[PDB]
Design a protein around this nucleic acid. Structure first.
Ligand SMILES: [Mg+2]
Ligand SMILES: [Mg+2]
Ligand SMILES: [Zn+2]
Ligand SMILES: [Zn+2]
Ligand SMILES: [Zn+2]
Ligand SMILES: [Zn+2]
Lengths: 162, 162
DNA sequence: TTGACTCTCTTAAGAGAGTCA
DNA sequence: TTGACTCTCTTAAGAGAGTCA
């Protein structure tokens, strides 16, 4: 809600509830042929999810609290960042999973960045493979690799140069 | 159905027409602090665009030919790949700009790959910076770099471990 | 047959808000 | 007040199809 105290109270209540989610150990590529372990705090697959939580999409949830007798609601991963600017260079800030695990609500696996920065982590070589993200990746992106391109650049005649 | 010969004729007329688009010289990062040059064949900003071409969106065009009284139409960047498979690993193939210049129709700047592979090139370090794409990038992706993350992983209490 | 417009759709990383009990 | 559902939206890489003369 409006006051800093009320916002801290929201974050604290969210942390307490999420802190009781099941802790799931995930072994992940780090890049450079190395592997690490992440501890994700995973929201349940079906109701009940936890106090204040409700599912608005297949992998979308919202956190809800009643403050000043009114309902205040946020995207479930946005709550750690309620005291942060909501935009950067005119682009909306988004909650961004460093563990690439949407059910995870561990705030140590979340950052707050443009949707472009968010997406780009999917292809990052990872913290041991050359990640240059200023807020460092926790793992190699799930889509990192050579790709599966069907056809490369080509011409039939002689009209073009690279 | 169009025969192989008719499809080749479509590709050839498309190449003829695109080859008359203005050729614009761009200096681009290759990764590793090196600079290179790309020569883009850029569709005009406004009508007329060239024989067979029409704009269906701000940065979307289509190519149209009428063959034996039947109107055929294709996405304007898909024509080089009409003799290729249209899907791979269960995913639709998409025209993918290696030059990241949507107006460019240079087929030496295009490849044919999944939308995920396509998107991921935006963050690639480039052919001189560590590109691992099997069909190699022509330049460092425009979004490569440290990013502009507003807030990193953080907790107010002690409920979580990474 | 052709040009120049019009409209909506897909994907996978993210969102806001309403209807009931 | 709290829970459990419903709906559509945003973005930036890509698409398909209709109307009229
Ligand atoms: Mg993400
Ligand atoms: Mg692209
Ligand atoms: Zn996690
Ligand atoms: Zn990274
Ligand atoms: Zn180009
Ligand atoms: Zn690459």
């Amino acid at each position: 809600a409006l006051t800093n105290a009320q916002i801290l109270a929201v974050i604290d209540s969210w942390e307490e509830t999420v802190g009781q989610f099941p802790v799931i150990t995930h072994h992940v590529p780090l890049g450079g042929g190395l592997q690490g372990t992440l501890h994700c705090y995973e929201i349940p697959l079906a109701a009940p999810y936890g106090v204040g939580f409700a599912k608005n999409g297949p992998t979308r949830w919202q956190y809800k609290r009643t403050i000043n007798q009114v309902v205040h609601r946020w995207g479930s991963h946005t709550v750690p960042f309620l005291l942060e600017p909501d935009n950067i260079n005119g682009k909306t800030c988004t909650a961004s999973h460093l563990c690439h695990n949407t059910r995870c609500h561990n705030p140590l696996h979340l950052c707050w960045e443009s949707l472009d920065d968010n997406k780009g982590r999917n292809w990052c070589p990872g913290p041991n493979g050359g990640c240059v993200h200023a807020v460092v990746c926790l793992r190699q992106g799930p889509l990192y690799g050579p790709g599966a391109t069907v056809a490369g650049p080509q011409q039939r005649g002689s009209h073009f140069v690279v």
